[PDB]
Amino acid sequence: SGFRKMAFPSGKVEGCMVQVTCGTTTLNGLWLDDVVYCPRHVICTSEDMLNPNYEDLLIRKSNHNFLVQAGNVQLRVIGHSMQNCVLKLKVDTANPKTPKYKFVRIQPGQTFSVLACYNGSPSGVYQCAMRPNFTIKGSFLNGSAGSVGFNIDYDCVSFCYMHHMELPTGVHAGTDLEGNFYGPFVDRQTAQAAGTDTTITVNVLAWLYAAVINGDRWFLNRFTTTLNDFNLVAMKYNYEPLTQDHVDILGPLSAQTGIAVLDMCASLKELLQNGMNTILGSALLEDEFTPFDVVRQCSG
């Protein structure tokens, strides 16, 4: 019993984190096989940050300008290239602690474990979710660039995020492991701001199922309704539109509880005007838990 925001074991990811230094700028790097992945603003300086020419700054750089330090061994860089907003540093020695890994780009709402590192050394781990405005509400300080987000299915580490910068509101933005950012963000110190944040709906519904599973039932109400009734409350409260492929994903969570997907959808409306009148220690509908996170934790 018990429901908690728990992250994947970061052990296999900790074995791939190195430190990348170009001149005096330093961040974290992902050492997979003989290739190191890191954000491309490591080639910048404190003055090349307003309007950076990454393609020109890289032309002025050679292989010896990239200093990769993997614990005690300093890796000799014998190749470099740029792909979107990340750098690829080809080293002479493949990483012996390389796990089975693929690179994926997640959708907004999907969750992933963030291994916060500083100077190539892991600092902490925590679960994060792709917010609908294409940001993440994490905890990053200076030097956290290069920290990666991942999901673990068996032995496959699906790398899906790499940290880059922080927005003036406290949220963070990054790219996939191919360099493509998540949203309309760029690696420039220009005044950037994310769109208004909505609420992941399929995630609050899965969290609602985790309540009746682990104990909390004081909030249950008494209504059954259909699909169009769900839209009658979704747009006003900034709740993400439900899809039909979704209700198949909430299927197993609904059958295990005897309450159909749309049967639980009826409880949503009365919850949004007056509230709960604690639920797993939270007085709000938590949207940071995907249905996959509930099945993995509650019924696994």
Binding site: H41, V42, A145, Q189
Partner: peptide, 8 residues
């Protein structure tokens, strides 16, 4: 807006 690398 801060790029979260250590600049010296």
């Amino acid at each position: 807006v801060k790029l979260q690398a250590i600049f010296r």
